[PDB]
Amino acid sequence: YPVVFIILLVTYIILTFVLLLNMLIALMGETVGQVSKESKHIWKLQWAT
Amino acid sequence: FNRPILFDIVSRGSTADLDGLLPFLLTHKKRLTDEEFREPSTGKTCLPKALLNLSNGRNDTIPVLLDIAERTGNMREFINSPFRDIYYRGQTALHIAIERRCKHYVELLVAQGADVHAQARGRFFQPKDEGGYFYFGELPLSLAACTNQPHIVNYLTENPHKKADMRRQDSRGNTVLHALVAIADNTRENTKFVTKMYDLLLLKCARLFPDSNLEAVLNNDGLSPLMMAAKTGKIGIFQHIIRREVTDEDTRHLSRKFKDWAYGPVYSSLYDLSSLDTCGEEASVLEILVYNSKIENRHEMLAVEPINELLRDKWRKFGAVSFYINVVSYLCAMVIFTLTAYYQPLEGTPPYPYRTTVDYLRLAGEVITLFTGVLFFFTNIKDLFGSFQLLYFIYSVLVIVSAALYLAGIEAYLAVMVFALVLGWMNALYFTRGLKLTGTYSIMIQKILFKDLFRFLLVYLLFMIGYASALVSLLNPCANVPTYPSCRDSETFSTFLLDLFKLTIGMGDLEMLSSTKYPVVFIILLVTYIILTFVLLLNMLIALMGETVGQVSKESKHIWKLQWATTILDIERSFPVFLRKAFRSGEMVTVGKSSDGTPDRRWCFRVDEVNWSHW
Amino acid sequence: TDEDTRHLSRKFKDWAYGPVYSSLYDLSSLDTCGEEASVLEILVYNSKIENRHEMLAVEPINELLRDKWRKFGAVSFYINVVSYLCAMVIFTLTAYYQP
Amino acid sequence: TILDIERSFPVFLRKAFRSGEMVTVGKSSDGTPDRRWCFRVDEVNWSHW
Amino acid sequence: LFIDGSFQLLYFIYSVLVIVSAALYLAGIEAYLAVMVFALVLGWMNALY
Ligand SMILES: CCCCCCCCCC(=O)O[C@@H]1[C@@H](C)[C@@]2(O)[C@@H](C=C(CO)C[C@@]3(O)C(=O)C(C)=C[C@@H]23)[C@@H]2C(C)(C)[C@]12OC(=O)CCCCCCCCC
Ligand SMILES: CCCCCCCCCC(=O)O[C@@H]1[C@@H](C)[C@@]2(O)[C@@H](C=C(CO)C[C@@]3(O)C(=O)C(C)=C[C@@H]23)[C@@H]2C(C)(C)[C@]12OC(=O)CCCCCCCCC
């Protein structure tokens, strides 16, 4: 059945490369973006250690 | 006096103009309620015309017009005459006097006999989203309470004449406490007096008829004045109902947030769950704020005082424990369903001599699959006696469609079973409600990628159709041969646009069409197609995703609270009722013993508070 | 608010019924259909571009633009885009089918 | 855009649309109640109003 | 700031290079189409208006 195999392979290339990657990058872009205040305080805690 | 005469007489407010017209009424047997001097458009009579055109608060024509109508006989027909217009329908003269904020003439129309339960069922008197201007009530008692009149709302209850009780539902079921919610925007000037008259008409109803909770009276949608503030988005009157302590000994059953013990700075407080949380026995405020809330301040209404801990309490009582069960019993059931596709030995017309326990391990695999197929079906059956409720229904049917084709030996069994296996792992992606990071990106791409990729789709389709049809027109016709790298063919519409964006992204090597009319203009238009398109259109989308990630970062906390709320209520509404009554969050507190003593069987909730300022 | 100089106004009160007040503005020169000069043409075209976006959104000038969009603006613009798009597709065909 | 389309109309069509209404404002020196083209804006006020 | 003057100028480049590709097609020269290729893309750049 190449009629349905090409359908599911399109859902693979859409969801993995386009969707799930852009889900992850946009997640990185706002969660660990503003760690300028956080990682400064953790290093000072690490430097004191 | 004709018809436009007398309406112009009372309009200026000049008295002594008719001055003995009462014989002329009795002469030709003319009466004020007759259609002669009534305006044919609306239906306005003498007394409404005076009240709209009032001068400095008083109209001296009205005690004349009351006395003239007294002698003619029509007073019950004259005071109570609805505007039969479809734009003011039902509006008596009582509605006008309460409108224009004059206590004086309200006292006269009550004394001469009003129709104080008058339903102004006009198109003017509709909700704002229903083609109307000012909703209120549809009743004269509700006009005094919605338009901020404390003195008139007192007078309409304790009158010597016909009493307007606070219980009467209108044409759509709304009582006055439904009406105070319906005119309450959640601003500051609004929710100042709205919380006052919600109190002043609740306390008055208990010092009246003491066996009826007025708030318990439902409108004709089943909602209550708390659930009507829940569904229509209000927060000003919503906070007030939950935190409503009343210290009077007669009105103590009308109290939520009971005060409790206090050992120094460990002040306790005891909130009620009369409508906030039932175990399926009744409607719920918590179900309304999470599922169907006319999508308004859900992040502000799921925070108030007790709703914030009632979801924290259900989570670590049954919620978190049943959630990890709901993950691994679903994720293992997919792996069981996965291996029944990889190691499936039938490929159509099933192998009747199975005869192997390894085949019998796999044979139990479809039994688990058929169990999940029939149970996801039966959960969806008992719903319908909705986005994701239908996707589990798709996964339920396609198992059953496969299981019929399995026993029939139809070769299309293996084709349909993969359509379940693509869809089932998409619902494993749905079980992220509580893992903060994964649940964050789930509804990112819903609004951010149906729009921006579509917004990217316009500017690329505007460009490409322009450039490619320009550049295939730049090519030569077949005059010498049917080869695309030399001439234009029927597939030139296809193979150019395939080769068009390929040359941009990764095929930067030569790939040049030699046989053209003017090669000096082809290379220039190709250079513009590199930079005036996709390269610049990439830098747009980086600036799009650069700025629209700041919008989802603003909603970071506010989408996780609603995912976590839908997590708990889906677990809770799937349980049987005796199991939910086993898990009644809070405790059965005896708190009051009011008349017909039989003390308060009221399922309350503890919230402790640490304060040194009050101390 | 007085009697002799009431005609020197541009926001007249029209009707009121509790908190649903209705005021009635004037379009003496805020919108003229070509018989005069008009402020709404001067605001969009012949204006100093510093506060132009802050003078459109005061009172009716904000609402009068979305009202003309509601009457003939959205209609004749949507006719305009499809007529220009069906003009360039015709000009597309005169390019490829050019013997 | 909206003012660009409206210029492209002739005056005959442009007077026929005429956003607003022809109200009777209030009595003036020359008999007539100051006939002016007008536009209505409705507003809620639960305040001191 | 070219808020309306951009596309008014870009409509003028289109309105010239249709006439130029017309007149070069009118008398003798086969180089009418080289200017007309510009008239295509400017005809479709101006749909971004
Ligand atoms: C003290 C705490 C313990 C309390 C007892 C535990 C609860 C028992 C009961 C239990 O676990 O029930 C869950 C329910 C809620 C659902 O998730 C079911 C699957 C769907 C789709 O219907 C998603 C839902 O969240 C949902 O939205 C609806 C409508 C029902 C639940 C699913 C079953 C009914 C089979 C289910 O079972 C699972 O294992 C969940 C995932 C589905 C896997 C199928 C498992 C069957 C064979 C492996
Ligand atoms: C219910 C409403 C009643 C309607 C009555 C009549 C409505 C006419 C009203 C109408 O559609 O007039 C259009 C206007 C807006 C423009 O497009 C004119 C062309 C130029 C050139 O600079 C400018 C514009 O493109 C522009 O930027 C804006 C916003 C106005 C349009 C052009 C005319 C004023 C002649 C025009 O007419 C066309 O057909 C050109 C269209 C542009 C190319 C398309 C093909 C031309 C012929 C369709």
Residue numbers in the entry:
A (entry chain C): 691 to 739
B (entry chain B): 149 to 533, 547 to 641, 654 to 788
C (entry chain A): 395 to 493
D (entry chain A): 740 to 788
E (entry chain A): 543 to 591
Study authors write:
Transient receptor potential (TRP) channel TRPV4 is a non-selective cation channel that is ubiquitously expressed in most tissues, including bone, skin, vasculature, heart, brain, lungs, liver, kidneys, and bladder. The channel is activated by warm temperatures (>27 °C), an increase of cell volume, endogenous ligands such as derivatives of arachidonic acid, and synthetic compounds. The cytoskeletal remodeling GTPase RhoA has been shown to suppress TRPV4 activity.
To get insight into the gating mechanism of hTRPV4, we subjected the purified protein to single-particle cryo-EM in the presence of the 4α-PDD agonist. One population resulted in a 3D reconstruction identical to hTRPV4apo, while the second yielded a conformationally different 3.35-Å resolution structure hTRPV44αPDD, with bulky densities revealing four 4α-PDD binding sites, one per subunit, at the base of the S1-S4 bundle. The hTRPV44αPDD structure, which was refined with C2 symmetry, displayed a slight deviation from the 4-fold symmetry observed for hTRPV4apo. Nevertheless, all four 4α-PDD binding sites in the hTRPV44αPDD structure were very similar and included residues S470, N474, S477, F524, N528, Y553, Y591, D743, I744, S747 and F748. In addition, we introduced the N474A, D546A and Y591A mutations in the 4α-PDD binding pocket and found various degree alterations in the 4α-PDD potency, likely reflecting the extent of the corresponding residue involvement into 4α-PDD binding. However, binding of 4α-PDD resulted in dramatic changes in the pore of hTRPV44αPDD. The narrow regions of both the selectivity filter and the gate were greatly expanded compared to the corresponding regions in the apo-state structure. The dramatic widening of the pore was confirmed by measurements of its radius using HOLE and suggested that hTRPV44αPDD may represent an open conducting state of hTRPV4. The opening of the channel in hTRPV44αPDD was also accompanied by movement of the intracellular skirt towards the membrane and transformation of the C-terminus that wraps around the 3-stranded β-sheet in hTRPV4apo into an α-helix, the characteristic changes previously seen during TRPV3 gating. In 4α-PDD-bound structure, TRPV4 maintained a similar overall shape and RhoA binding was nearly identical to those in hTRPV4apo.
